[PDB]
Amino acid sequence: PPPMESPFQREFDRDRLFSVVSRGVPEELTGLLEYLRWNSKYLTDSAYTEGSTGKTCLMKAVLNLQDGVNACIMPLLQIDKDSGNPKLLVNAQCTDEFYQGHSALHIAIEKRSLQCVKLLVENGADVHLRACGRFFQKHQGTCFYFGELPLSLAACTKQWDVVTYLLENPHQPASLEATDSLGNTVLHALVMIADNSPENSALVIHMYDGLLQMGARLCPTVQLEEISNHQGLTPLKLAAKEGKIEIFRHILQREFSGPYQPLSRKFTEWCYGPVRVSLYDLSSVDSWEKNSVLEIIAFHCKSPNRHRMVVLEPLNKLLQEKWDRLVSRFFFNFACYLVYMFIFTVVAYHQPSLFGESMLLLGHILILLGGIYLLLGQLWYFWRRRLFIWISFMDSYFEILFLLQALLTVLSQVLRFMETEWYLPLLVLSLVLGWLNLLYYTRGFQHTGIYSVMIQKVILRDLLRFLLVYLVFLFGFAVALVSLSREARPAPYRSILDASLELFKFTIGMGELAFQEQLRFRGVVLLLLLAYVLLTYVLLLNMLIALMSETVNHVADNSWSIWKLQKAISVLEMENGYWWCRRKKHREGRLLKVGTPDERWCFRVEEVNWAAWEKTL
Amino acid sequence: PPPMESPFQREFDRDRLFSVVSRGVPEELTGLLEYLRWNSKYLTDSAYTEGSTGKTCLMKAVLNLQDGVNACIMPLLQIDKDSGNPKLLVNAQCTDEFYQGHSALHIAIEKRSLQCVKLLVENGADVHLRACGRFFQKHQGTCFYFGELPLSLAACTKQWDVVTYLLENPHQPASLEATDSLGNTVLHALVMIADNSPENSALVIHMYDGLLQMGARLCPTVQLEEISNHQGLTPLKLAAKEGKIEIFRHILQREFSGPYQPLSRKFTEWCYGPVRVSLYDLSSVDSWEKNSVLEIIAFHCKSPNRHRMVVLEPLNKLLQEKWDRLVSRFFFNFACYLVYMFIFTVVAYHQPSLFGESMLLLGHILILLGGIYLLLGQLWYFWRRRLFIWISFMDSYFEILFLLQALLTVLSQVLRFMETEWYLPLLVLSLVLGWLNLLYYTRGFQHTGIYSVMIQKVILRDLLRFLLVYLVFLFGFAVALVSLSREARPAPYRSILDASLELFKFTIGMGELAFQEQLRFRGVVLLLLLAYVLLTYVLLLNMLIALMSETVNHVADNSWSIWKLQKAISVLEMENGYWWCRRKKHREGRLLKVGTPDERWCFRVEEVNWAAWEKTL
Numbered sequence A, B: 001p002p003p004m005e006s007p008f009q010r011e012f013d014r015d016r017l018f019s020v021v022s023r024g025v026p027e028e029l030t031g032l033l034e035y036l037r038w039n040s041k042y043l044t045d046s047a048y049t050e051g052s053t054g055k056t057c058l059m060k061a062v063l064n065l066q067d068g069v070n071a072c073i074m075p076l077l078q079i080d081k082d083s084g085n086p087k088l089l090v091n092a093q094c095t096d097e098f099y100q101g102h103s104a105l106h107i108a109i110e111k112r113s114l115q116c117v118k119l120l121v122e123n124g125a126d127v128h129l130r131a132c133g134r135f136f137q138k139h140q141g142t143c144f145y146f147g148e149l150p151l152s153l154a155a156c157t158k159q160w161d162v163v164t165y166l167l168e169n170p171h172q173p174a175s176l177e178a179t180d181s182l183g184n185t186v187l188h189a190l191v192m193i194a195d196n197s198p199e200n201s202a203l204v205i206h207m208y209d210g211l212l213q214m215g216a217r218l219c220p221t222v223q224l225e226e227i228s229n230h231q232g233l234t235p236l237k238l239a240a241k242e243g244k245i246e247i248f249r250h251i252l253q254r255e256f257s258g259p260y261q262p263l264s265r266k267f268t269e270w271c272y273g274p275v276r277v278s279l280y281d282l283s284s285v286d287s288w289e290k291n292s293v294l295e296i297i298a299f300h301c302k303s304p305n306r307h308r309m310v311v312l313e314p315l316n317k318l319l320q321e322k323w324d325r326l327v328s329r330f331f332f333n334f335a336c337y338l339v340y341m342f343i344f345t346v347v348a349y350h351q352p353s354l355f356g357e358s359m360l361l362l363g364h365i366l367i368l369l370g371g372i373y374l375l376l377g378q379l380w381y382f383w384r385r386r387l388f389i390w391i392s393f394m395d396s397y398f399e400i401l402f403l404l405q406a407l408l409t410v411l412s413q414v415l416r417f418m419e420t421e422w423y424l425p426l427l428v429l430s431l432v433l434g435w436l437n438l439l440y441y442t443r444g445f446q447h448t449g450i451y452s453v454m455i456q457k458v459i460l461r462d463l464l465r466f467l468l469v470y471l472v473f474l475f476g477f478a479v480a481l482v483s484l485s486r487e488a489r490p491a492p493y494r495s496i497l498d499a500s501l502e503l504f505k506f507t508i509g510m511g512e513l514a515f516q517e518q519l520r521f522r523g524v525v526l527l528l529l530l531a532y533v534l535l536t537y538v539l540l541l542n543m544l545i546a547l548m549s550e551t552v553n554h555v556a557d558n559s560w561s562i563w564k565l566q567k568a569i570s571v572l573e574m575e576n577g578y579w580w581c582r583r584k585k586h587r588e589g590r591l592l593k594v595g596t597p598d599e600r601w602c603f604r605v606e607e608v609n610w611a612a613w614e615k616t617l
Ligand SMILES: C=C(C)[C@@H]1CCC(C)=C[C@H]1c1c(O)cc(CCCCC)cc1O
Pocket: A533, A534, A535, A537, A538, A541
């Protein structure tokens, strides 16, 4: 990409004007103006910009600032005012793919100079110009997405007085409910620029609260937190989706006092010594609405801090009371699945060769009904999550296996109907997958669920890479053993499968090595087996030590948070009912008149904290 | 539960009075008083309270305070004084199950306002009213147990001047030796509200010492630390029972100087450079009394800090000299049990088929006598601990096994008397349990006892959850292997027991997998065995890594403290003698005249500390 400003890199005439404005002498510009009258030219023509981007001369003026001061910018406004052009200069943007839309007010705000932005919009510059280049889009290397607006650029770079001036100027008041070409307003942009660093979280929380208060002062009828982008997300939902937790935590529990009391969510109902009763707001933070923060946290967000967002209140108490409401249906589902797997096990064990036969036919048609029921249920589940199939796959890996087992038992039943003798491996693989999928329902109990999310420390990629190295080793020594044991002076290592088995048996502790005098090269085969044993012993040892050093590092125990996330995913998948009885969901919380006719569907938590009471003591 | 105060939630007329007292304007109340004369009503009637709880208007007055000040509370006292009622208002309580007994003095003290509580009890309010609701009982969610008294509420919320005023007012002096409806006095309540946080421990120690000194000043004849609740526990015993260690540690070793010298327990006998000789008090801190702190720490408390309470003095030296007195009886018991197990082993090994026979009959009747002796001893032990059978089971898990082995050998002897050929598995299981219970007596030696309490890192629940997952795996693949090996083209995996064995043998390193050409689906059975081996290898690896990461975290070594707790449990179970020779216990310590005619059964420790002497240097 071309650089915007470059102190020694080459990109009136063009170079003469660019050098005299890079210095910025206001009298040495004299002699330019009449030169524009003879040729009927303007300052925004393609011969007077950098023809690739379109970076005009005033953009170089606001780029090169003498300590934030430039004496030549208002000369350029006088020249463009009396240059005969219908169109302006300050509204003119670049045209390259990389800096598409990047005006000069963006540079005047970026350089943190109140004087130049004041002298720009006091002399008729636009404040809504969208800098929409690829440099200004997120999730790309060398990028800066600030929200594609001058007010969002002033907000995302901490410049307080430029925000208050841009909202409180008599020339052009910037729309606090404006948008970019992505749909994002300025609070969306503060959410997008946030990280999980503590100081950046403090900066974005500071600018968010201050901008929300100025929205109360300036535009009190509209509500800024209820505006959605082109994906239909409020800034709370955008903070839940893109994984920024600390601004999400700050928005979720927010208490203000006095005139800014209406734009709080954590109203305090009462207190009594150490007990404190708060009334949180469930404005789109519950599963009653279609697209809300619970469904976005569970099924839409792709981030590793996603399991920490169900820890914090009111989401803890909301998910806890939803789970207390639905734990009877969870264990009813588990009992139905246990009955189905008992039918599967008794049908498979008592299977005939290739009254009792009638009862087994009853069992077989019950298996086909249960299989087509689970198959339609899992297909409906994957159709509901059709937008994000990689977010139904990254964590909840049992919804793949329930589908796979149901598909395999339906296919095995139609292979039994179609006479084929290859149905019994499919029915057995279905039975194995069903008894394995029985361990999905261990979430509902506290301690075994905590252990079942604790028993997955060893990373699946960390296993597959070891399987790659071990299969290289086993295959190399397998072809080696068969091609050395091809000749003689039963026969071991006769085929590559039998030698692969006899080399794999060293890993399970059943491997036999001997000085087999049937072979001709018995010393070389014994030395090669010894080399295989030593190499795979070093291999398994290095895997054990490196995996233990990756795990045992005093890292924070996640198992309570991931267990609460798994129960949250389960209760949100369960609240829609089945695929035939689509039930109606409780509007959780009581509707309370709070402040001003603003009635909110509030949900009270009643929490005690002896440490917090004794420090407010 | 209904909220007590709620700033925007709806629960003269009732609403008019409630709003005008929530503001609190004293002149705008005028016009209420005559309205009570015409209808012959009062202020405490059910139409003038919240009819569910009974929250009167003055409770709303003391709830809504203008910075701890309310100008309307004494107007309400004038109205109730001249309202013609026989009964009062300030004594009137709520009547809901949740806030049962919660008067208005409790709110006046809770809001930390000396003015409102002064204007209450200077105008005739009770100070002994028991707030006994379910909100005010402990061990429940959203609860605050402060002791169900106004003085206990002032003490448990750090308010120093309200305590000194409530004890030192000329209107109604609060009884420092009062009680709730549970038996607890105020020092009991300070024990109940304590935690193991350091700052809360400092707060409860500060209020405890100050309240004890004011008990010396106000009520010097009675002793506040000798008052027991309805379970019969002093506050030292309540601190030992409910597990609060730091207030227990502070009460146990307490030194004061000067006029508060009589209410100390750690009197200093002498010092000589680094050696320091102290005279601790054994007022109910020894096993001579029936119910004391040693028997409560060992056999009554249910807490994980229970093993740290035998570390600290004088309990360390007391248990050490008791163990030096009783270690000969401990190893006499161990030698008797070793003789009994040698008789059991020689009788079992030389058992006949289904002089020497007479000697074996002598051995059999010796086994029956030893078995009925151990059975009666363990039944007497479980009858003595009949109140807390879960505290004879949570730590001391050998008293279950001694009972089980004695019961099994008595049952095996009566099955040999009753001719039955099923006696020999019971006698063998008794012999196994007896040789296993021989490892109980390893407590008496220092280093092997420290190792035997060190060799129990792996949690029993952490094993049982792995056993659940592994049994799911083994059962699924067992029915899979038998139903695939049902057909052919000896026979392996013929039954589910034999396949369960041949799959369990992979875990001990003896499992055989081969390309068994007797079977028809030999490739599917080999692939299924390979899948079982890989899955259980990942399973055992995840158990090992997760269990090692749970254990190896630089946690503090408990093994000395739990070894001292095990020796304490042993010496307290041994000091009662056997179930036939119930011996008399030494009153440990010397009776010394200390201060004023207050003779205490003191026990001196003689401890050196080079670090403590050099900082007092
Ligand atoms: C079974 C042996 C002899 C031990 C057993 C335990 C451990 C992990 C070390 C084994 C061992 C190797 O497994 C391999 C070598 C030589 C490395 C070969 C690669 C150049 C030495 C070596 O002591």
